[PDB]
Amino acid sequence: DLKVEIETLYEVSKILSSSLNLETTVPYIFRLLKKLMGFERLTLTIYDPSTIVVRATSSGGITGKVWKHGVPIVIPDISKKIAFIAVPIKSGGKVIGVLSADKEINDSLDEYTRFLSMIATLIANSFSLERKVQAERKSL
Amino acid sequence: DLKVEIETLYEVSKILSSSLNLETTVPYIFRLLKKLMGFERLTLTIYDPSTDQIVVRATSSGKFPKEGFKKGEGITGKVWKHGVPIVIPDISQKKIAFIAVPIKSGGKVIGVLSADKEINEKDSLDEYTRFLSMIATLIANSFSLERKVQAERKS
């Protein structure tokens, strides 16, 4: 399965390195996470430091604490168990959003969390870069 | 093991996604492949299709021949232009392998990525080659994207 992880990480890495548009990119990423990793009910939200710029959701109140303290929250069993993961999207020193998902497990959960956190960080950077480029267009 | 490849891939992708400029990017990437994967004397060369001149040329840390070539680079002269990975498991003339993976965007190959690896019985040279390809593909994409940004800039 650790091979499937690299494959997924690599695939999302390609999507990002070739496109500076998160609002089309994210859906592709969710698709990958859902098809390979087996996530579900994925959801992302990113707020402009001024305030809510981006929002996406998967197909088919705890997040609040991730904004406050900017640390990964997890609940191994909501009631095989269904876990709920919510990692912080943080770049520029602040937390700018949260990435969440469900993952039915039998399996190591802490690994899925470490992974979903890797995506959140990659996404955090792309968002920053997309805004930097928009800034150049604004000046001109 | 794969746990190291994941971290390394994650680290390089965390760089490519932070800036468009390749010249300040590649340096960090080479420093990772060297300290995590155990590569060395890595080199990246991207050409201009029309003039066949060098657009990008980055080399890692370490001793390079007085002439700038890597012994392996001189050997595999412009063979990368076929879009196929080249490898010489031994460069004798522990083993020292040389890997050269093609950088291809927009269909055409536009450069090469090379690295030397001190292999042994415990590590597979075939796996390292596959990994260097992933990096080559990511680098190609960023190069492509930096040009698209440079284009919309002139307009």
Automatic annotation (TrEMBL), chain A:
Domain of life: Bacteria
GO process terms (BP): positive regulation of DNA-templated transcription
Keywords, ordered alphabetically: ATP-binding, Coiled coil, DNA-binding, Nucleotide-binding, Transcription, Transcription regulation
GO molecular function annotations of the record: ATP binding; cis-regulatory region sequence-specific DNA binding; DNA-binding transcription activator activity
Gene Ontology cellular-component annotations: protein-DNA complex
UniProt name for this protein: Transcriptional regulator (NifA family)
Coverage span on the entire protein: 2 to 172 of 506
